[PDB]
RNA sequence: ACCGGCGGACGGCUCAGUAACACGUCGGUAACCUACCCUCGGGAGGGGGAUAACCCCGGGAAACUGGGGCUAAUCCCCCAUAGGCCUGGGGUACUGGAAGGUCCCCAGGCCGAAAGGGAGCCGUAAGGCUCCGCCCGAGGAUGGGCCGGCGGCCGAUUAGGUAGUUGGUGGGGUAACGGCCCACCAAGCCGAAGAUCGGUACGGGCCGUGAGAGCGGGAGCCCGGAGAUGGACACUGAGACACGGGUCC
């Protein structure tokens, strides 16, 4: 009876890392392709307006994003359904307002609020690394996001390590490596929005994903996927993690 | 059409029955019986997802490429034996795996002709 | 009739203020949308043409009724973000 | 070679495409034991894995048995009897699956 | 049978109607589309018609025409026979879609007596 | 009102058919397609051509529909360059658990782009700014396609079933791997641990009952699958062989 792609999202089916009142109404935002997946990340009107409260409905909300008074990392969002993910930086310049898009230890997103200076940095972990046409090295971050550097800066970069950023700009500051003694930030799983620092490293045959062992500031030892491990420092974190 | 879907027995033997009608993904196309002639002739093909084939009915040159990398553009004579059918070679029909005769000798298929639009072999030694 | 401001808040990307109130009065009938209206803007010296009460609701049992109200800061702006039927039950536009 | 397994590669060399050790084939997915109970067909053996499956109800378990068709590449001539390892890859033919990667134990 | 003539004028964009009664429309009759042939046997004058001091060599070009029933003629389509036909483009059919396909009954290029309106332009 | 663009393949309804990779769960696609959306790196050079609307004349009971003239585009077509796809010979820079993958250097070929368009504010002009836009490459994301292990129903007053069937060697076709199909070579494959055949039935989350073990149901809500009077076919589109599009019986 399917002919083609979905258009519409039940309230009953919508992602549970949402904080959405699930019986209220029928029918939810079904999120646009964008940065980051469907499980870490809404739409940018349920921020707007059942998060922030700035708005009552779905009309003066889609006002407010049309006059551009909302900005996503360093960039104005107009679009209602634009994905907004984990480590995304929300901007309100008109009331001075900037939080970070994180999960908590249930697993369901929230705002937490942080200050002008780190406004503009937004972390991004290198997800793959490829070559293009001209010998050019090509990285794939955790939202999608591509960079691309020459051939020299080859041993520079490397999977599983984070890249701050200035946004809009687009510009790197500094690379943070995936190594031993390193902190990280859990984003999915069991042990979410847990912090600590690197261990070791266990690597499996066939291709089952690596596992990570992270001691957190108390002394407990807990693991983890290496790609859920998030890198967000040398020895403490560059970035308000609470 | 030409289905290209699960097909009707089983592995033990028995009979199955189509819960659901054919599916418009599931269908193939007629053979492009490539033949050597004078002139070459190609049409494109409209695909699943808007893409793009090269369809090649009649060949009449080859890029016949030696161990030293040089590749020439010649003429295709005949097909010597082709092993995929028996009626290939007196029928003069190009596939991957077929040998024909050219200006420079004898050549061995190495690139699908109804998939890729051109004639590209090995030389013989 | 005793009209208590639980919450004032200041939305600047709309450029408002919605206000949370209760209306404290055992013994009497609901206050009428034009006594309330006029005793919230006596008391918070807010303007008469770009006030608009959204609700004043009533409870089962109850001497307190719950109203909300929004101020805006200019007349236009209220035209252009607020619904035409909410203005009509105001008494804002003659429609 | 190494090529995702912790066993050792086999000793002689084929000209196989399909073996994954000498040609193109490529090997991902479950990996599995078991004894070859058929080698009849060309490059070709049905592998058969013994397993207890437990009844809720009565609080028992009862013995089922797994079969699979799987490759066999001419470097690895497994025969009827032998312990022999599998992995999943891409589909070989109707019912085929599976390839053989290693003969633990000879018959 | 009788014939109703559309005769357009190219070179000005005006039309006329004309009927035919029972002679020249046997000459008319056997025609195909495209048949050139000259205004003189056709019994008009097609000076006062138009107001024009058209050219003695003016001849008149079949284009097309409908049958009683109001069906089209295609020029495509030989002999004087009314079939249905599977169309997406050309006389007889209005695509209205992207790329639908609708049968229709058309007529064939050679004028017949069952033809009720002949449609011919002038050509000098 | 018309041309043109997008949508109309989602939503809404039903449980007919289906004992099957249909469903549930865990894994693969290193064997595949994807319009709308996000990021980075690049481009927008030169030409041609119809026609809708409108005017004249109509045909037909209608449904529908003919001829001529005159026009524009983000409409269509052509050239060039970028670029894609195949094959042959070399270097190993990259991701991966592992390269028929990516990248770089030669060679033979086929295919082969665009809308510098629209709006606003300035500026004497030239030119400048903002917004919405167009094409290619590399990635994502979104919705799917295909594949595997395991699980879930009764009848032996149904014991043999299969012959493209099981496997292979070479190809064709497909977006993709595959007897999916073809040519050739062998006799394989399933089965008393219930084959084949017949009966019934959409599968699951769940619901009813019982102290529990268990037994019974699985219409309403959610996810997945099928169907549009019974069938079979195709066009357009990223997506259909399409409930309110098409053809035949
Ligand atoms: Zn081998």
């Given at each position: 009876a399917r002919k083609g792609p979905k258009r519409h999202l039940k309230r009953l089916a919508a992602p549970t890392s949402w904080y959405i009142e699930?019986?209220?109404?029928?029918w939810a935002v079904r999120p646009r392709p964008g940065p980051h997946n469907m499980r870490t990340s809404i739409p940018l009107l349920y921020i707007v307006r059942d998060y922030l409260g700035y708005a009552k409905t779905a009309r003066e909300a889609r006002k407010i994003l049309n006059e551009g008074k909302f900005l996503v990392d360093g960039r104005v969002r107009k679009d209602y359904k634009f994905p907004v993910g984990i480590m995304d930086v929300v901007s309100i310049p008109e009331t001075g307002e900037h939080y970070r898009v994180l999960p908590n230890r249930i697993g369901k997103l929230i705002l937490h609020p942080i200050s002008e200076d780190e406004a503009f940095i937004k972390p991004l972990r290198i997800r793959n690394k490829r070559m293009i046409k001209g010998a050019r090295v090509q990285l794939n971050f955790h939202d999608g996001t591509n960079h691309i550097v020459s051939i020299a800066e080859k041993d520079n970069y490397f999977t599983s390590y984070t890249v701050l950023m200035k946004v809009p700009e687009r510009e790197i500051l500094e690379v943070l490596p995936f190594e031993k003694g390193a902190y990280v930030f859990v984003t999915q799983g069991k042990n979410v929005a847990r912090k600590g620092r690197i261990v070791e490293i266990k690597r499996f045959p066939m291709g089952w994903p690596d596992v990570v062992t992270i001691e957190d500031e108390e002394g407990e030892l807990f693991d983890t996927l290496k790609e859920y491990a998030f890198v967000v420092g040398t020895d403490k974190p560059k970035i308000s993690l609470p | 059409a030409i289905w290209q879907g699960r097909?009707?027995?089983?592995?033990?033997?028995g009979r199955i029955v189509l819960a659901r009608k054919k599916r418009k993904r599931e269908l193939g196309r007629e053979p492009s019986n490539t033949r050597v002639a004078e002139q070459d002739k190609r049409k494109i093909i409209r695909t699943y997802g808007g893409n793009r084939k090269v369809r090649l009915t009649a060949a009449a040159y080859a890029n016949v490429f030696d161990k030293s990398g040089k590749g020439r553009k010649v003429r295709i004579i005949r097909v010597?034996?082709?092993?995929?059918?028996?009626?290939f070679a007196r029928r003069n029909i190009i596939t991957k795996g077929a040998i024909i005769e050219t200006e420079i000798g004898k050549a061995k298929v190495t690139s699908r002709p109804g998939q890729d639009g051109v004639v590209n072999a090995i030389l013989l030694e | 009739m005793e009209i208590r401001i639980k919450e004032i808040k200041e939305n600047k990307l709309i450029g408002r203020k919605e206000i949370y109130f209760e209306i404290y009065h055992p013994g009497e009938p609901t206050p009428s949308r034009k006594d309330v209206k006029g005793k919230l803007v006596a008391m918070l010296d807010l303007n008469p043409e770009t006030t608009v009460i959204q609700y004043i609701r009533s409870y089962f049992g109850s001497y307190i009724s719950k109203g909300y109200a929004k101020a805006y800061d200019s007349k236009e702006r209220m035209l252009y973000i607020e619904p035409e039927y909410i203005l009509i039950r105001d008494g804002l536009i003659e429609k | 070679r190494d090529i995702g397994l912790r066993v050792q590669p086999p000793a002689e060399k084929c000209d196989?495409?399909?073996?994954?050790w000498h040609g193109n084939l490529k090997i991902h997915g479950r990996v599995f034991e078991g004894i070859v109970?058929?080698?009849?067909?060309?490059?070709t053996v049905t592998v058969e894995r013994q397993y207890y499956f437990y009844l809720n109800k009565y609080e028992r378990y009862e013995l089922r048995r797994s079969k699979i068709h799987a490759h066999n590449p001419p470097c690895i001539n497994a025969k009827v009897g032998d312990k022999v390892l599998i992995a999943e890859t891409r589909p070989l033919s109707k019912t085929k699956h599976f390839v053989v990667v290693a003969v633990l134990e000879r018959a | 049978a009788t014939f109703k003539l559309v005769i357009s004028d190219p070179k000005s964009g005006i039309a006329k109607q004309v009927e035919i009664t029972g002679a020249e429309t046997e000459k008319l009759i056997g025609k195909r589309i495209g048949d050139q042939i000259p205004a003189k046997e056709l019994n008009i004058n097609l000076n006062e018609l138009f107001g024009k001091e058209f050219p003695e060599d003016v001849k008149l070009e079949i284009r097309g025409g409908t049958d009683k029933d109001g069906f089209p003629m295609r020029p495509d389509i030989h002999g004087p026979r009314r079939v249905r036909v599977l169309l997406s483009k050309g006389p007889g059919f209005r695509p209205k879609e992207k790329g639908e396909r609708r049968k229709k009954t058309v007529r064939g290029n050679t004028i017949s007596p069952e033809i009720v309106q002949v449609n011919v332009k002038l050509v000098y």
């Open positions: 699930r019986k209220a109404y029928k | 097909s009707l027995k089983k592995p033990s033997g010597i034996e082709n092993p995929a059918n028996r009626q | - | 196989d495409p399909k073996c994954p109970v058929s080698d009849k067909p060309r490059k | -």
